[PDB]
A paper describes a structure:
We synthesized an all-α-helical peptide (LL) that contains 16 amino acids of LL-37 (residues 17 to 32). Similar to the procedure used to create the MtrDCR103-CASP and MtrDCR103-Col complexes, we incubated 2 μM the MtrDCR103-nanodisc sample with 50 μM LL for 2 h to form the MtrDCR103-LL complex. We then obtained a cryo-EM map of this complex at a 2.89-Å resolution. The MtrDCR103-LL structure also presents an asymmetric trimer, with the three protomers displaying the distinctive binding, extrusion, and access conformations. Again, within the binding protomer of MtrDCR103, the cryo-EM images depict an additional large density corresponding to the bound α-helical LL peptide located inside the open cleft of the periplasmic domain. Our cryo-EM structure indicates that the bound LL peptide occupies spaces that form the entrance, proximal, and distal drug binding sites, where this α-helical peptide spans both the binding and extrusion tunnels of the MtrDCR103 pump. Within 4.5 Å of the bound peptide, there are 31 residues that secure the binding. These residues include H46, I48, S81, D83, S85, S87, S89, S116, Y125, T128, S130, S134, R174, F176, E271, D272, S274, S275, M570, F610, F612, S615, M621, F623, V662, P664, P665, L668, E669, N672, and R767. In particular, D83 forms a salt bridge and S87 form a hydrogen bond with the LL peptide. Of the 31 binding residues, only 7 residues (H46, R174, F176, S275, F610, F612, and F623) are also involved in Col and CASP binding.
Residue numbers in the entry:
A (entry chain A): 292 to 340
B (entry chain A): 147 to 243
C (entry chain B): 1 to 1040
D (entry chain C): 50 to 146
E (entry chain C): 874 to 922
F (entry chain D): 17 to 32
Amino acid sequence: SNSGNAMATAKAVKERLAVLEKYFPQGMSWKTPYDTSKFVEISIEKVIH
Amino acid sequence: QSTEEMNDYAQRNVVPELQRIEGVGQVRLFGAQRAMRIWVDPKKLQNYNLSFADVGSALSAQNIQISAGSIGSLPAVRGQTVTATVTAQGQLGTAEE
Amino acid sequence: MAKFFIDRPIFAWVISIFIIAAGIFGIKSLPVSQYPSVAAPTITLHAIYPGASAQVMEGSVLSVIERNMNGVEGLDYMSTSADSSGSGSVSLTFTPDTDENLAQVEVQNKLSEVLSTLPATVQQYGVTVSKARSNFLMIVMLSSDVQSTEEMNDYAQRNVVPELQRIEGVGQVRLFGAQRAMRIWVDPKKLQNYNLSFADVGSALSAQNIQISAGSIGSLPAVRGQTVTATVTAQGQLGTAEEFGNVILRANTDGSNIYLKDVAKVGLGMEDYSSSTRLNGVNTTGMAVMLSNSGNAMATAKAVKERLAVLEKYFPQGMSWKTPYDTSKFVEISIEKVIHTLIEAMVLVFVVMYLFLQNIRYTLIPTIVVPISLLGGFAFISYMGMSINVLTMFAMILVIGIVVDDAIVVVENVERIMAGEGLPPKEATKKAMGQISGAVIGITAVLISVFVPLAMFSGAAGNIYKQFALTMASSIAFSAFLALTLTPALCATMLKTIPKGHHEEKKGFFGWFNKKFDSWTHGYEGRVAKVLRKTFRMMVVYIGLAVVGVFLFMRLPTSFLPTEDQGFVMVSVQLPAGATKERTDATLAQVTQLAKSIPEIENIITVSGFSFSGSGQNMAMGFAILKDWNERTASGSDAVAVAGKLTGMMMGTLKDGFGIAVVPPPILELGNGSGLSINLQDRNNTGHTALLAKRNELIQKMRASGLFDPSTVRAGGLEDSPQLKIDINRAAAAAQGVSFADIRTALASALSSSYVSDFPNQGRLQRVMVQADGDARMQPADILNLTVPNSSGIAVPLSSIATVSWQMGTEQSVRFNGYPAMELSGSPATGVSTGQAMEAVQKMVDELGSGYSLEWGGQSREEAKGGSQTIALYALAAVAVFLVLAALYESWSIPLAVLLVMPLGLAGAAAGVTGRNLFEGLLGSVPSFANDIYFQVGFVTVMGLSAKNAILIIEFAKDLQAQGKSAVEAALEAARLRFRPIIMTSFAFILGVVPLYIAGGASSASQRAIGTTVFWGMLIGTLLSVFLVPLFYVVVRKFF
Amino acid sequence: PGASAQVMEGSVLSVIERNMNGVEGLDYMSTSADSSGSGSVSLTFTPDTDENLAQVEVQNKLSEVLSTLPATVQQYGVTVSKARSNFLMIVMLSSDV
Amino acid sequence: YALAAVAVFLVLAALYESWSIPLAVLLVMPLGLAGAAAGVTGRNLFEGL
Amino acid sequence: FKRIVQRIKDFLRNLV
């Protein structure tokens, strides 16, 4: 969203998906193979180091 | 499960939860939720002398929501002790119907 | 700064004049209401779909609207509710710090997207988007006992409502009565006689009652030479029942012209017929007035009453007006209490000051300074955009005492210096202020540090705390600023030198009191020396006291606010399912007479149609307005006692149905904050039966095999009721010409009303409704006598193509966050924290298979969050206090001696609450005190005052040691020096809080809570402090 | 359409105007109706009132009140504008062809 | 005009530690008012003539 | 007018 934050939004999405997994039909999983917040977090960590 | 069933489950359970998350602007499913699909053969319509509009009109006229009402409704005669809700289905829910 | 203003009294006076002016201006421009806004924003939908059941309403309207609401900014949760009344609502709750106006406009813009996908009748009626917030002010009742409720409702809508909403400060006026309408009551027998149908009636009404738009003559693109243009007007609408009865339904070739008036009766009526209201057993028309944001409640109520008194002149014979409830009285009483407490505090301060300092001009300084500090607090409150209400007025009442101390300290120190060294008032003031200035600065910093955390809480509780926090902080800051500038100037100017060499060889009362107080001070110093000589034992005693106080504090009940006698009781009446409005009205008459049998009840308002459980013809409720608090002071005349008496009478009198009387929570907008509220969702859309079975299983698990006080565990809905189910054979209906949509129209007009057109009625449009005669819709056997047209246009009864049988169906449906849900309530068994009970129910819900989730609602949503925020805030507050004291004393270890006084106040408060609870139990009264919001506020107040006293003692002790005295000698001298001011302030503050200890009347529950906490905490803390603070100093100096 | 100035004023403009009382920072109101079935309500706010908050509040109240207004008004809706009445410029276009 | 006079009075009193010096200062405002009013009246008369 | 009634009883539902 305009004025949204990538890292916080991605974390919220992943936590909500983990919570919702408990109600899935049998045999159903979930993945996020594409995620742009990983680069942001890793780069921030490297600069902090 | 096939991609159709999974798409329907996503639209009904996952998408609203995701778009209720803060910072989300839009969620796009690369697919669609389910629907009742009628696949008409024009040759059979010719055989029976019918039309596409006939199919549409028959579907519209025979599948609707009915609001029956109630018995002993609020303006009532003197001595009314029984009130009830009336119900009628009028709607189809399966492909055979 | 003090030295600067001691030489410039007029500059200090000018600054104080500016402060007074700012305070007056702030008071002039403050909103006034009984309570502020504490709940979060909420938007509701309120659609009408006539003639439908809960399932139909839900699936066809509410789910469709709900699905387009995921995406509005700042949405916390969402819910739906449908009943058998033909109306439903969608409720959207929003995260705090969300603009309610923006939320409402966004919800409306989302509704506009899917509005066209709703049933046609829903679109005809429209959907109303509004905000749940209501700034309710009054109820206005019109009673006649001569003319029907239709007449009174019409008169109100036409005359009274427009006049009230033109008054200043009025934000909205709502009429609790249906508008007028043109009603057509069709007899189906006559319809079948003429081979006509309800559809024909509706079509004729719509075709023959319509607006005509002709146009004008000589419109712009006119021929050459045109000189005149005129507007052409033709009226094509009907306005009387005789005109409507002449509508042509069938123009026969012979010219018979079957008219509308020989198949139906046409006359003016109402549009609901659902709800009825009465006042003491007579017909009434109620109105609700809502104050506007930034409005003054007292002024608006007075103006409304004046307007109604003027308008009373033109009422029809028999009609009278009455306003049985008003919220402005509460805030009026609170302001009067503030003024009375201020006057009493001034008188008490004068008395003690004159008793001790032996002069009349010493009493003048507190009198001047305290009101100025209060006015500065008022100015700050206005600047921050708050309002005058009960909570802010209570904060003023409570901060009066501390601002009084802030001046007693300075005046006492100056008077001591003057009497001791014999200096003139100017030199004495300079010396005293040089002594105490830094201590004053540190004390104000500590007070701000302790009060700021109360403004950082979250939720409705945080909103409630913010009032006290901001008001008190501003008052304290201004009091400190005044003590550093204007108090020393007043001391140096208005005082006269004590005759040099005088030993106060007074006569009569003054000499005697001086001698006795000197003996008391000497005895106090001896006891303190005894305490100081043996230090290990006293430290052990202090640890014991602190541990016991902490233990007492932990074992206290937890609550939000104590129920208050707001002056009325509520009654809810519920009858067996399927009962009719006539039986409910009989029961309501019984309830009215029973209320009449109670002297404590002034007016009784009964409303038929809905209850606490919900809507229905078997539901009802009543409002009992009690007499004034003054007329109700003896035992058993309080709201709880009146409710108990009414309930006991009802349980023995009423035959059909049951009634319950209760008192509402202190704040109406904020729902009940007691119990555990459970939402049981169905993720897989199994069905109603499965979810009901799971709810029953969960109820059994909670009650039989849990810890929940089995009594309170019950469902919060409305059990299923028998219904009539029509089964239609598709083949049979197709064999004839019935099209399943003619059935829809026929039933919708026969068993329920139909909204066809709109007509003018003396200037305003009103609905036309066709509902069919009552004789044809009373019995189940009447359903199959209804007729529906064929393709050929002939009437065929429903009996041929349909059957009807009794079934069981849902009476009410609710969704929570987009899934079918059930609602449950509960309460902890005994000594069980809410956290473990919530964990237990979460485990039980997990025990149920997947597809069934859990969600908290109301206060349980906030209580799910741990109490870590409070702990963190108080820990940070303590750290800040430590740092400020270390800066003040230029030490790391001295500040410790000041922190050790916190347990003393905590123990005093907890012991006082426990003891008063036990005493009331002995007297037979049920416990009424808990660890609620007011307890926390009072604890903060007493803790700050004790910290102030300790800080002053430690400051005096430290300086004496630096001069050469040992630690023990310095502590003794500091205690001897601080004895008198501490006695004075304790006396004044304790006796000024005493009135809040015995409070009784309006809002007296919170008053009593604060009074108990403050009184006992202060007394015990001061008694322990005057003996233990020197011990703390000595120990801290010895150790480090 | 089809309503006289009196009907338009008493059925639509008056209803909106009466419900417009209590809006923050409102100075005065006026209405104008005509024989051609058109009408308008003008709300003037005090200076130091920002147009955006007043716009949002006025529109919220208007939506709240529209639930009862006449059917044809609901079909056409109610338009909103907030621009200066007085002219800044007049732009002219001239041609001889 | 009343607020202007009051503000001048209070500021002078705070500046000079008196209640009488500002009172002496305030006595000059009527002279300025008389001058201004006489000037406006006189220019009106002169233009009329 | 059902909507006004719906509003009043929703508030009442909440309190008790």
